[PDB]
Amino acid sequence: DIVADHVASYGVNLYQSYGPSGQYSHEFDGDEEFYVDLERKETVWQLPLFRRFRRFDPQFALTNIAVLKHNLNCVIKRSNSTAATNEVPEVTVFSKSPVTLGQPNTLICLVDNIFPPVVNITWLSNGHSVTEGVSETSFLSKSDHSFFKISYLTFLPSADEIYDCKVEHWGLDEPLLKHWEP
Amino acid sequence: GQVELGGGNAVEVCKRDSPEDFVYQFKGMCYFTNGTERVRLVTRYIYNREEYARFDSDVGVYRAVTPLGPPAAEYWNSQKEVLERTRAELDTVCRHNYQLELRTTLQRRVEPTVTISPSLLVCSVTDFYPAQIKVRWFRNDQEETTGVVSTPLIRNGDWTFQILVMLEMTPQRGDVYTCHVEHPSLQNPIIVEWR
Amino acid sequence: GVTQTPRYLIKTRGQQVTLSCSPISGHRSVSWYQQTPGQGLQFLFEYFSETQRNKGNFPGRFSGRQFSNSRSEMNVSTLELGDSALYLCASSLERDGYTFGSGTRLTVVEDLNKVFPPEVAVFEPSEAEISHTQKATLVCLATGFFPDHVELSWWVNGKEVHSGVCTDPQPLKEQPALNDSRYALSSRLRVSATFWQNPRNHFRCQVQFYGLSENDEWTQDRAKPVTQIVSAEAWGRA
Amino acid sequence: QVTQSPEALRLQEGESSSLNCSYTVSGLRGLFWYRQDPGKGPEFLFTLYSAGEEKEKERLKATLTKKESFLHITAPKPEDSATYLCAVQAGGNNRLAFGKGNQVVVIPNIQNPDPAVYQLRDSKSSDKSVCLFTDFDSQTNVSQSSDVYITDKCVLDMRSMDFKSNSAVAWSNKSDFACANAFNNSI
Ligand SMILES: *[C@@H]1O[C@H](CO)[C@@H](O)[C@H](O)[C@H]1NC(C)=O
Ligand SMILES: *[C@@H]1O[C@H](CO)[C@@H](O)[C@H](O)[C@H]1NC(C)=O
Ligand SMILES: *[C@@H]1O[C@H](CO)[C@@H](O)[C@H](O)[C@H]1NC(C)=O
Ligand SMILES: C[As](C)(=O)[O-]
């Protein structure tokens, strides 16, 4: 183990062959500083403090990911087309703050041990799907080279309504529902 | 300001239930200790979940990790241009980007919110940064009760932390329960009482 | 090494050109550049694994592509008099180290009737300089040619000679106030006085002119200024 | 962007000098030095990554700082005469932002100067009368002019090993044209 005060990840470069998708993001102490919208060629910082002072050329991602795509093709042939083995995720739902009715909060659905990074995360309110107030984190890196993604749901706590976080992954034989109620 | 950079990804050697998927990952890990007095760059080349080739600034050259990247590691060492540029990213990427962590990340100090609520008693310490926190339970005359249950440090994923300590005690009609919380953002500890 | 095709090219306004560049074997990145006077080297675009990975500030008519052999083409639709330049090509493994080629010299002309092959003439040494310095200097005049696609070389007894050769850096504009002016180039070959006074020695000034090709039409009364070698020779005198 | 100073640099053979390259980019990935002959393509020289980095090759030395870069030349030769180009690579674009260059001209030391003007024999395929100004110093000015064409100081062949003498040429088809003084002055 490498003992350091601060472990930076200036370049979490990911490229997968499924529906040609990828990701570029910098991390610091396990927190995502920004990601690059490879479609819009935009650097999306994850804090107002970062947008105010930090800068990153999004072209670097498109340049680096283009090499990720090249290296993937050479190891596919070298590894006898060893495909990725799916993993069973670890879904945990909880609130960011202690819940009192009427006072708004946000529900945090942590989906750990994601591999391959292809997942579908939904919030269900009384069976029906939720559309508003749903943000999502990028795939964050782990030392074992799997990933964990966190979904967010800002809600108004009411004893009438209950919420479920639905997670769909290839490592799961069925969509995993995680229930949470006040 | 100053535009930040990431580590460059070296080019490679050659010029039934669920759908198959092939994953490639590149990780430019910068390790910092005692400011920038001890910096270390470790670039990681991953196929699926197998780290096969890596560069270590303590080693100075590309070393193969698995039998999947002896061709790659020997290819990047024979290219003198790739070697000199990778050794330079210790200053070009690691030391360069750390200057803006001093101005932004390493100055972030969010005060925790300390509440007590029955579930027996649960002291929720939520929304704080950085990670260092110290939460003690006390009953009446400074009795630090040890029979407590505390979660691991919970990472909310939005640059805020959260920890929920739980105390199981027999409350008489004249007891007092206080949650003692310390955080680097607090000049004095936060205390919250209970019946 | 890096190879660029063609070396010299001539086209009129409104038409297009396609320049080729084969990078160094084992290299995958190809950067294109434009070198103009007053603007210097300007980045066109970079290609990697058959896609344009990086681009510059040139308009849309500056396009290109890359093939499986890492070889790249660049195309320039609707040519312009300001597009005349030396189009360089940088080869790279991918990102570290850029090796430029010899470049493609493109000259856009208002009309092909302004192209002229050179008139080459040699001038024998003066007896005055033979007596004073015991050396002999020949002068070659290639004049009245447009554009600047000219390579001058001296030949002594069938072999090309570089020792004693001194050529002007750039040609001389016969009409300094015009933009389509005819050019004039000069060069000198100084040999020993005993060498020139040897009647068995053969001297030749060769001027390779790069002009029109077979794909080009000609409606003028004079001859088509095709790519040709114009030379003038002179034997020694006793 | 980037700017190099001086734009032109003519110095006699043997004297040392230094070239400057001042850059202003954000996120520098590397500074490049190049060498270019007029018709040729740029020739690679150095690549500097970090500040305070010194890399020395043959009679050249490249230094990098946080604000500028120096390319020192030690005892140059006539072959060292070229346009030395400076480039920087910054940001996410792998392009090269080149400067405007330093037109370096290293003039050879003429050992035995003896300026003289000769008239060469006329050609059977030309109506011109050529004059030859040759065997003069390395630091001599040659100016043109009317209907009389005058060349400049020719540049010796790069692969030449003998007869290193500067020569100028003037010619005209005018009858009132003599090679007596169709050129300039001996200072
Ligand atoms: C591995 O490569 C060879 C190719 O012929 C062969 O053994 C097989 O098709 C591949 N896959 C395996 C062994 O799973
Ligand atoms: C969610 O993902 C699963 C497999 O990962 C896929 O079969 C399903 O169609 C997805 N749902 C969408 C895209 O709505
Ligand atoms: C930390 O770096 C400083 C700077 O020199 C110095 O006090 C010491 O060498 C290092 N280690 C400590 C303080 O434990
Ligand atoms: C931390 As977020 C939900 O803006 O990616």
Numbering used by the authors:
A (entry chain A): 0 to 9, 9A, 10 to 180
B (entry chain B): -2 to 12, 43 to 146, 156 to 231
C (entry chain E): 3 to 29, 37 to 58, 63 to 72, 74 to 81, 83 to 253
D (entry chain D): 3 to 29, 36 to 59, 63 to 68, 74 to 82, 85 to 163, 166 to 207
Task: Give me lines lifted from the publication on this model.
HLA-DQ8, a genetic risk factor in type I diabetes (T1D), presents hybrid insulin peptides (HIPs) to autoreactive CD4+ T cells. Here we report, the HIP (GQVELGGGNAVEVLK), derived from splicing of insulin and islet amyloid polypeptides, generates a preferred peptide-binding motif for HLA-DQ8. The crystal structure of three TRBV5+ TCR-HLA-DQ8-HIP complexes shows that the TRBV5-encoded TCR β-chain forms a common landing pad on the HLA-DQ8 molecule. The N- and C-termini of the HIP is recognised predominantly by the TCR α-chain and TCR β-chain, respectively, in all three TCR ternary complexes.
We next determined the ternary complexes of three TRBV5-1+ TCRs (A3.10, A1.9, and A2.13) bound to HLA-DQ8HIPL11C. The three A3.10, A1.9, and A2.13 TCRs bound the HIP peptide in a broadly similar manner, whereupon the TCR α- and β-chains engaged the C-peptide and IAPP2 regions of the HIP peptide, respectively. The A1.9 TCR CDR1α and the CDR3α loops were shifted approximately 7.3 Å and 5.4 Å, respectively, compared with that observed for the CDR1α and CDR3α loops of the A2.13 TCR. This positioned them to make similar interactions to that observed for the A3.10 TCR. Of note, the CDR3β loop of the A2.13 TCR consisted of a similar motif (“LERE”) to that of A1.9 (“LERD”) and displayed very similar interactions as observed for A1.9 TCR, including the interactions of Arg110β with P5-Gly, and Glu109β. Like the A5.5 TCR, the A1.9 TCR had similar affinities for HLA-DQ8-CpepL11C and HLA-DQ8-HIPL11C with affinities of 11.8 ± 3.1 μM and 35.5 ± 1.5 μM, respectively. SKW-3 A1.9 TCR cells had a 25 fold preference for HIP over C-peptide whilst the parental clone showed no preference. Clones A3.10 and A5.5 were both unaffected by mutation to P6-Asn whereas the response of clone A1.9 was abolished by alanine mutation at this position. Clone A1.9 responds equally to proinsulin C-peptide or HIP, whereas clone A2.13 very weakly responded to the HIP peptide.
